[PDB]
């Protein structure tokens, strides 16, 4: 059968998938194992359905893990020599014993590397003229528009609407069609609203029959008679003919 | 239908994952300290 024969939705779970655009080309064969008995086959992502949990986010298929509120909402602190808390003991070690005490450990470097959160990034004039990452519905309020140094990242819906309205719509943008192609008339339609062929001579079939007809209708043999060839005049040379070397 | 689409004014169409304008262009231009290691 021709390249596949495809069926109804049947539950599965992914046991092997690669995100790599090389390890997993177009189309991305999802190496899956189904729910019936766990049969492992490679079926592409076109034949897969995810239990969305939200209609928007890029990964809809995981929840929204709420996190703990801080009454010290702007008073958090972040060590930066290790932001991700990779330097911690999760279990007591067998090398924990030879540990010299907190004596002479004068400036425990983490305590002097941690920053309050406000410090890492600055709200600089780029942030004070920062342009939006969406199509703004209106920037009339933008009294910081030009003198203050702002330009939208996306034309607002309102001025797009002005620019759509102010000007017409061409009737040749709709391409309605219910009759079909007119095989006989539409091309030989009125000589004013005619389909001028364009490009080569090899597309001017009507005009050329026309040119033959006009040219014979005006040009008489009593005019086209005298027109000599080169050989019919070269005949009277004392050497009319000599083979090229 | 609506020449200005739904998803832009519809709070029902608002993104649960709308990550705003200063957010990413601030958390992006940072460069976290290059000296996580005492030696390196």
């Amino acid at each position: 059968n021709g390249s596949r024969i495809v069926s109804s939705p049947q539950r599965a779970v992914i046991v092997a998938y690669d995100r790599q655009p090389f390890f997993n080309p177009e189309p991305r064969l999802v190496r899956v194992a189904f729910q019936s008995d766990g049969s492992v086959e490679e079926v592409p992502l076109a034949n897969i359905m995810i239990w969305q949990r939200r209609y928007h986010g890029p990964e809809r298929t995981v929840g929204d893990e709420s996190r703990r509120f801080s009454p010290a909402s702007l008073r958090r602190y972040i060590d930066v020599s290790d932001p991700f808390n990779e330097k911690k003991s999760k279990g007591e070690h067998f090398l924990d014993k030879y540990e010299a005490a907190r004596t002479s450990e004068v400036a425990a470097g983490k305590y002097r590397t941690t920053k309050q959160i406000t410090e890492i990034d600055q709200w600089t004039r780029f942030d004070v003229s920062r342009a939006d990452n969406f199509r703004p519905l209106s920037i009339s309020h933008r009294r910081d528009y030009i003198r203050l140094g702002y330009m939208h990242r996306y034309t607002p819906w309102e001025w797009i609407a002005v620019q759509e309205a102010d000007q017409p719509l061409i009737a040749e943008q709709i391409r309605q069609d219910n009759i079909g192609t007119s095989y006989f008339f539409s091309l030989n339609r009125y000589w004013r609203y005619k389909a001028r062929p364009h490009g080569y001579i090899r597309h001017f079939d009507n005009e050329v029959r026309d040119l033959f007809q006009f040219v014979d209708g005006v040009t008489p043999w009593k005019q086209a008679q005298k027109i000599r060839t080169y050989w019919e005049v070269r005949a009277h040379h004392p050497m009319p003919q000599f083979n090229r070397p | 239908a609506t020449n200005i689409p739904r998803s832009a004014w519809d709070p029902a169409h608002f993104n649960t994952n709308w990550s705003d304008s200063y957010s990413t262009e601030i958390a992006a231009r940072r460069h976290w300290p290059a000296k996580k290691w005492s030696i390196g």
Partner: peptide, 20 residues
């Protein structure tokens, strides 16, 4: 999945960030 969205994102005028 914003909690109490039918009063906050839908019916609270200022999106719940603005205090009137």
């Amino acid at each position: 999945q914003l909690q109490s969205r039918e009063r906050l994102i839908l019916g609270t005028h200022g999106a719940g960030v603005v205090q009137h």
